[PDB]
Write a protein that binds this ligand. Sequence first.
Ligand SMILES: *[C@@H]1O[C@H](CO[C@@H]2O[C@@H](C)[C@@H](O)[C@@H](O)[C@@H]2O)[C@@H](O[C@@H]2O[C@H](CO)[C@@H](O[C@@H]3O[C@H](CO[C@H]4O[C@H](CO)[C@@H](O)[C@H](O)[C@@H]4O)[C@@H](O)[C@H](O)[C@@H]3O)[C@H](O)[C@H]2NC(C)=O)[C@H](O[C@@H]2O[C@@H](C)[C@@H](O)[C@@H](O)[C@@H]2O)[C@H]1NC(C)=O
Ligand SMILES: *[C@@H]1O[C@H](CO[C@@H]2O[C@@H](C)[C@@H](O)[C@@H](O)[C@@H]2O)[C@@H](O[C@@H]2O[C@H](CO)[C@@H](O[C@@H]3O[C@H](CO)[C@@H](O)[C@H](O)[C@@H]3O)[C@H](O)[C@H]2NC(C)=O)[C@H](O[C@@H]2O[C@@H](C)[C@@H](O)[C@@H](O)[C@@H]2O)[C@H]1NC(C)=O
Ligand SMILES: *[C@@H]1O[C@H](CO)[C@@H](O[C@@H]2O[C@H](CO)[C@@H](O[C@@H]3O[C@H](CO[C@H]4O[C@H](CO)[C@@H](O)[C@H](O)[C@@H]4O)[C@@H](O)[C@H](O)[C@@H]3O)[C@H](O)[C@H]2NC(C)=O)[C@H](O)[C@H]1NC(C)=O
Ligand SMILES: *[C@@H]1O[C@H](CO)[C@@H](O[C@@H]2O[C@H](CO)[C@@H](O[C@@H]3O[C@H](CO)[C@@H](O)[C@H](O)[C@@H]3O)[C@H](O)[C@H]2NC(C)=O)[C@H](O)[C@H]1NC(C)=O
Ligand SMILES: *[C@@H]1O[C@H](CO[C@@H]2O[C@@H](C)[C@@H](O)[C@@H](O)[C@@H]2O)[C@@H](O[C@@H]2O[C@H](CO)[C@@H](O)[C@H](O)[C@H]2NC(C)=O)[C@H](O)[C@H]1NC(C)=O
Lengths: 223, 416, 219
Amino acid sequence: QIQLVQSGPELKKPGETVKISCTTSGYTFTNYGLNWVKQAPGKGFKWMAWINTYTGEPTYADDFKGRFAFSLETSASTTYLQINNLKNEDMSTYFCARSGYYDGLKAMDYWGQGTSVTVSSAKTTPPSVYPLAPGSAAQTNSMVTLGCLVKGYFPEPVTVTWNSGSLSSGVHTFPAVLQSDLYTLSSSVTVPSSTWPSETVTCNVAHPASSTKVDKKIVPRDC
Amino acid sequence: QGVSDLVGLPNQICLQKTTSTILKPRLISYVCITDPLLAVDNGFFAYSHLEKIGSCTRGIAKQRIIGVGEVLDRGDKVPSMFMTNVWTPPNPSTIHHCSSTYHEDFYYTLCAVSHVGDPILNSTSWTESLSLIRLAVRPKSDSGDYNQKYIAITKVERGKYDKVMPYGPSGIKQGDTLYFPAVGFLPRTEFQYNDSNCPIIHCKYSKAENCRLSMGVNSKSHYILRSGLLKYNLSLGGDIILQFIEIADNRLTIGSPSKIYNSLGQPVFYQASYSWDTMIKLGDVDTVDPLRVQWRNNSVISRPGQSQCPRFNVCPEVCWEGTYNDAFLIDRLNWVSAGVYLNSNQTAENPVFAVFKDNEILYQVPLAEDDTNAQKTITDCFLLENVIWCISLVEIYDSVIRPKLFAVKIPAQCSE
Amino acid sequence: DVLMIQTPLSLPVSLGDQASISCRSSQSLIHINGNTYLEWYLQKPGQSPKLLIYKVSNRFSGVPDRFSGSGSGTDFTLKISRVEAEDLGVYYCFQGSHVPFTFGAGTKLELKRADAAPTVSIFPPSSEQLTSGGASVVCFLNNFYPKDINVKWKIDGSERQNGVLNSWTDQDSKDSTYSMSSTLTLTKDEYERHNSYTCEATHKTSTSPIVKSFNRNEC
Ligand SMILES: *[C@@H]1O[C@H](CO[C@@H]2O[C@@H](C)[C@@H](O)[C@@H](O)[C@@H]2O)[C@@H](O[C@@H]2O[C@H](CO)[C@@H](O[C@@H]3O[C@H](CO[C@H]4O[C@H](CO)[C@@H](O)[C@H](O)[C@@H]4O)[C@@H](O)[C@H](O)[C@@H]3O)[C@H](O)[C@H]2NC(C)=O)[C@H](O[C@@H]2O[C@@H](C)[C@@H](O)[C@@H](O)[C@@H]2O)[C@H]1NC(C)=O
Ligand SMILES: *[C@@H]1O[C@H](CO[C@@H]2O[C@@H](C)[C@@H](O)[C@@H](O)[C@@H]2O)[C@@H](O[C@@H]2O[C@H](CO)[C@@H](O[C@@H]3O[C@H](CO)[C@@H](O)[C@H](O)[C@@H]3O)[C@H](O)[C@H]2NC(C)=O)[C@H](O[C@@H]2O[C@@H](C)[C@@H](O)[C@@H](O)[C@@H]2O)[C@H]1NC(C)=O
Ligand SMILES: *[C@@H]1O[C@H](CO)[C@@H](O[C@@H]2O[C@H](CO)[C@@H](O[C@@H]3O[C@H](CO[C@H]4O[C@H](CO)[C@@H](O)[C@H](O)[C@@H]4O)[C@@H](O)[C@H](O)[C@@H]3O)[C@H](O)[C@H]2NC(C)=O)[C@H](O)[C@H]1NC(C)=O
Ligand SMILES: *[C@@H]1O[C@H](CO)[C@@H](O[C@@H]2O[C@H](CO)[C@@H](O[C@@H]3O[C@H](CO)[C@@H](O)[C@H](O)[C@@H]3O)[C@H](O)[C@H]2NC(C)=O)[C@H](O)[C@H]1NC(C)=O
Ligand SMILES: *[C@@H]1O[C@H](CO[C@@H]2O[C@@H](C)[C@@H](O)[C@@H](O)[C@@H]2O)[C@@H](O[C@@H]2O[C@H](CO)[C@@H](O)[C@H](O)[C@H]2NC(C)=O)[C@H](O)[C@H]1NC(C)=O
């Protein structure tokens, strides 16, 4: 039951200050130091600092000086990473990991679950949901693809089903991306040409932060 | 032919790890002899020591000698050293920290003059005053000051330093300029150090201050010691003007006895590992003025210590502990070095002549029976009929404490 | 800083084959205390990274014997001896000898399968969004393999790179394919200034681009 447990995900405006916590148990706190690691979305890892739990002194990389503070509370058996003056380029996942001294093992054997820091000036915005119906180009090989565009909402997550879940297979729901403070994602569903538009295909979007429910029926175009 | 410097393409040497005893040491030397100095250059040698009565630690000094001589085939194709010119100061208690560099017809030996004892331990009661003693390698009679000449240095440019002092056995020439190993005393208050740069990373009981605090003989010393060089340019005529060159701060440790030499046409540097960086510090010189060394990342050779900074310690601690055990580069392309180390962790004993690269000891052989106490070692390597030889001085307790001298031929092959 | 070159960055394997990742170093990793601190980690989607190998060749508590680490100096190799489903994931080498500590780019260990051209679907802006004053053209490129694909947008035959928003899924757990979405956003006004919108897919399955198009002129 050696475990690392980090504070919950964070939503912060540009310029604000966040303080991530990582609490350890199942071993004597000061027989191991602790690394902080940064993972940018869809990218690799970057080492940030290593803090000595006996002395409290961090050894940090040059890229993380000044507006980054690596401290600890020995009583609570926990360590903290504070980021002042937050900017877009800090939006990332931050892990804490156990790293012992030269007296033992200094590889990172146990990791925390991660903490996600999101940076946007937006308050809770619902999604704008638009339907995607094909144009005149022929219905390829006795199947048709339809879609939903879920634009400009905040924060994550939305959930997207088709026909209240009836169509689970044949669905690609894509990861949302953040642009100009808001998330956009899209979803495609693929069904046999007989079933659409003979029977209805409607997509169901739910955004709980704003308490929003959308249903959009996909209907064909004259064009 | 005869004896010459390690230059050109020497006869090839064994480059594989081998625990066969293929090194054949040959002793060439036959109450206390201490503070030794050895230096070897161009078939000539400089040697110094201090003879004390009673202790080696306390005790009145009866005689300081500084000699130069020739290094020749002693008869059995084994090189030894033949004294040719010896100097003795009147007061053997006033001469300290001599270091010898060779130029053409002479050996110039730069010394500190002290009436308060060792300037390292009495650093703020010592008034900086230095001297040169010039000794001809091939003296001739009735030649005035040719054989022996004594010069008091009057002009020293120390840069930002309070006092400067030769610190090490030997130095080099470049053209007609001499560079001696040296040390600068700097007030602890004027010392600029960022504790952020103290490598404390995986060190449980280290604190970032430990580097700064270990730049002097103790944590509350008035002065820190930085190693470096003292330049003396012979083409200037006039009187002797000495200049101090501070060492760059990469892998910076406390000022300590160091040595600069030429090998295969390039200058190499070795600095003794007092303080916490107990792994051996040596390497080629990037620049002479200012002094920068590209230290080897050597993982196999260290030095004995005491409780806080023992052999193989890499963690910053506040300590002033260690021994001068140098090594000489003998092959630059494979960075192979020869030198004598004390194979023990916390006691000064068990000399071992080793040939080693950064990460492995290729071969080695002890120079005594186990538990024989030892101290300073100085090794210098040269060519004899294009065969690489090394001579090493090793301080030893037997029963007299005295420097023994060994000649070691480095083999061309690894068959036992 | 020390750079860590992982090659390759994608490793397609068939279950039960053997795989090997080369991590190579810009400066030697032999610490002056004699230890070479080169470690291998594995991250699975939505999970923490897990410690696989330490000090070059030493496996961690709980690691199958299939995982073996070798190398010295600046060249190191991770070897997986037969590949299992629970092996697939992202592998990171990591040096801990010189500050700052650095990772490799990562190697994706993925499942091999026959090549598969994408199904490309284009969608004009909906009447709803046009009413609200925006205009997004959407392109779906579904169920393709291998992963490497490039999409180009054209408007009336000129390339458009501004306003494009791309997204992609990981390897589908059933068909082992990848899908991707590309959205070009514009104002209502600039969309109605033009007539033809085209989506071009470049993929190893066809020497020519896969082209889907629509003309706003057509009803
Ligand atoms: C002379 O000193 C060395 C080094 O001592 C260490 O460093 C100094 C600075 C100081 O901190 C000492 O307290 C340290 O011990 C000794 O070599 C080392 O000796 C210790 C104790 O005998 C031994 O400790 C065991 O290590 C096992 C494995 O350790 C792992 O981590 C290390 C890095 O931190 C790796 O180098 C190693 O490969 C492992 O991955 C561990 O399972 C045990 O529970 C102990 O903790 C060191 O490992 C040991 N290692 C080496 C590589 O030097 C010398 O000790 C003597 O020689 C060695 C070769 C062994 O035979 C020892 O048993 C023996 O006492 C010491 N010599 C003397 C005469 O005292
Ligand atoms: C001690 O730290 C000082 C501060 O270093 C800087 O601040 C800390 C908080 C941290 O952010 C460091 O990573 C920063 O570099 C060092 O002084 C700094 O030295 C750097 C490197 O020379 C220098 O950058 C350059 O300076 C010139 C302008 O003079 C400029 O034209 C370049 O574009 C570039 O910015 C910093 O300006 C300088 N900071 C200050 C306030 O002086 C200091 O370095 C030592 O002194 C400096 C001036 C140089 O001679 C360095 O080579 C030298 O080591 C550090 N001192 C030690 C002993 O480590
Ligand atoms: C023994 O290991 C040492 C490391 O512990 C080696 O020193 C390192 O050598 C590499 C290769 O030359 C250097 O990387 C280069 O650095 C320069 C810039 O150097 C400047 O900046 C750094 C940090 O910002 C600073 O430490 C320097 O003093 C300089 O101010 C780049 O331009 C290159 O592209 C390359 O990245 C390391 O910086 C250097 N580190 C140290 C601490 O000296 C040493 O070379 C090894 N010795 C041998 C014989 O192999
Ligand atoms: C030791 O001192 C001697 C004596 O001065 C130095 O010789 C000097 O060397 C430099 C450069 O090699 C000369 O400086 C410049 O020379 C050029 C011609 O190369 C000239 O055009 C410049 O106006 C300038 O003077 C210098 O003249 C020269 N002096 C003599 C008497 O030769 C030597 O450099 C010194 N060595 C060291 C290591 O300091
Ligand atoms: C360390 O130095 C002191 C220096 O004391 C005196 O003051 C200096 C500023 C300088 O002028 C010196 O020449 C002076 O001697 C030594 O202390 C003196 O020692 C002598 C000889 O034993 C004695 O006659 C004096 O009374 C001492 N004076 C004082 C003030 O202590 C001291 O012995 C030196 N230490 C070492 C380790 O030998």
